[PDB]
Amino acid sequence: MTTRIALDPFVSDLEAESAALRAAGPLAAVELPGGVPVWAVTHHAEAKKLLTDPRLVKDINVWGAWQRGEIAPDWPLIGLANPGRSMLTVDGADHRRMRTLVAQALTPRRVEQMRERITKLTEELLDRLTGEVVDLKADFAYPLPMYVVADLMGIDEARLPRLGELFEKFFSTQTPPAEVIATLTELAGIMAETVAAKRAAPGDDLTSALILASEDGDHLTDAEIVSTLQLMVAAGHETTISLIVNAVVNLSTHPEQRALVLSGEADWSSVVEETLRYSTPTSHVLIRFATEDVPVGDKVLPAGDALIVSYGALGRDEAAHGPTAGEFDITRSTENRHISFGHGPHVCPGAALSRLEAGVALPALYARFPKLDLAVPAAELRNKPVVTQNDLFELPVRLG
Template sequence: MDAVPVDTDADTRTDTSSGGQATTADDGAAACPHLRKYSLTPPESRPLDEPDYFGELRQECPASTVTLGESGSSWLFTAFEDVKTILADTRFSSSPLTPGFPLEGAPGSDAPVAVTTMIRSDPPVHTRLRRMVAKDFMPKAVEGYRDFVCATIDARIDSLATLPQPIDLIESFALAVPSDVISKILGVPVEDEAMFQELTERMTTLSLTREEQYQVIGEFAAFCDRLISLKESEPADDLLTRLTHEQLLTGELTREQLAGFVIMLVSAGHDTTAGMFGLSVLTLLQHPDQLELLRSGARSWDSAVEELVRIHTVVRMGPRRAATEDIEVGGTLVRKGEGVIASILAANHDESQFGPSRFADFSIPEEKPKHLGFGFGPHQCVGQNLARLELGYGLPRLFERYPDLRLVDDDITRLRFREGRAFFGIRELRVHL
């Protein structure tokens, strides 16, 4: 059990009810004495697993209250079906400006540029914005990217052999590949790619104060504005040029909204896929029997990618929502103006859906799991098809090119993780080729 504080004197909530009616915040204390400080800290000896208290809450109290700071609190939902229900219901607002939205622990969410982004908008604004960019990430469009994505990955994999051994696979491959890909799709000049990575790293650091987050988001927006000006004067065959000329210059998008698009695609797309590359390689090297199933063809790489996305769930902060009216979820009544954390990390480890899900139990299923790693509902990850292409090609090619790939140190408790970040991942993964 994580060492997280329990406050039995505070206002706790539950989704259990003896009378067949929805339980509210006022009558759940006796049934669910689980008010805790919201923490994503895993067990010290099992750093790749979810916090232990998530499993306890799923069993005893799948809808509970957590404190987010000195003054804030929120509902925390941990069961798969409840989380799925919340993500599908547009009465739960994604906007940080909605009363009750759980901002604490997510600094910068309410910054002027951030609130204009697609992921922070509700219908009908969200629907309109998503339609503008979604076609570039539909399966057919992503298939059109296949040649250059595969060539990019092959080039990075080949270059690993020229580096002094052992190498850090995170810096030389996991971070490099998604950065190369998203920069090419957007049309970012090569000389600006390093700036993209630096701004993304800073913007997804949760330890920054609200003011510091506002500052880095402002810097990112200014950087994007410069790129937009470049596409205005020097159009090319890329996504940013299309959005600039078809949406910005026609008045369909504001300059701030277009900058928000770029920030979203870079931070949410680049950082998450980078995290998954590192975690996936580590997992397969730690489970050689599963890697052998892939090499022999007894299991498919498609199923492996989906299972890896499920168990690691790199997007761990939420999603976060606020109720815009009274809504019942799984027997629990969430009142208008109350904040909600619909934990996809907890949902993806729900024993009733997936069985044992600890890192030590990793096993590639015969069929692809129906997980929530890319979200669900209207805000489901717009770039998931691209992520699947990168992982589904990059992982088998890496192990094919370097069949003797091995870890320098196989003790996972000594790994360096990206602590205090919006997206989970490994900071360094040293390997011999």
């Protein structure tokens, strides 16, 4: 068998865990919180190969352990491992069917149309900051992407506080099993009430457009629209928030590079792209399954086994980025673009939106508060117990 790395449910030392995963790769055996063994791809080149390999599918019917009844229905990760049917959980024909309209709404041109609104919201959130020291996550980095995605999907703003409480339970490794299914049921309920509303009273949002497209069949069922809405709201906020948080942390801990960006010697896109490579919001993505045995390095991923993609660990792969891969350097040149938005047919359709949001938020923040810095030592920052995401509990900032 294998060396098997149990991922820390409390995310106490992500840097060490990522390094261990690289050391064990390209195909590392891991244990997910809750005791579930899977494989992880932890090197850049091998991940790109597996992300485009037709033997590595989203279809959970390929999962041996699932078919054998080994996966608890109240596993806290069950909402990531077995979400409702959407573009996320299919390949090929059905993937094109389920992705096309959403992806079309998020092209660079269509995102550029959102710039004014995103900019106005960014500036309003900066206007509302109160006190010398703020939790910049709760007061800025969290609300901007949640308001953007909620508006895109037709979600009533009045529901956002409750959605925030449900996502906290969805993501936490520490949510009691007895609360797991109820959280999933209530989240699905909010998305279903949103679909019902936009069917009755269609607007200019993407949910309204999905419904109006699927009227004369061949497009998405209501159940698929509900799952798609949950996928969009979750994917669109969780990650973008951590991108903005991690960019501020990285500039605060690398003040010589912050000085380059504030003086115009480096551009804000370089900060966003290096944050995505060095410190991706998404440490791991669940989940793919092998239809056949697949060689990965000197190991075999057996048919019916599962694969997570360890974007966090592979972002610092020295084979891809050279001997400085383990450092934050907005000036780097790499022969290999990061793959923190994925690769192959499932590559993130929201990448342009996330880049616009961070690309507006970060210069706006530092234009308002040029002297902003962490209000605590960087070593006091703490990851939330969210094994797939690189999310902090808070971002204490002295605004200046």
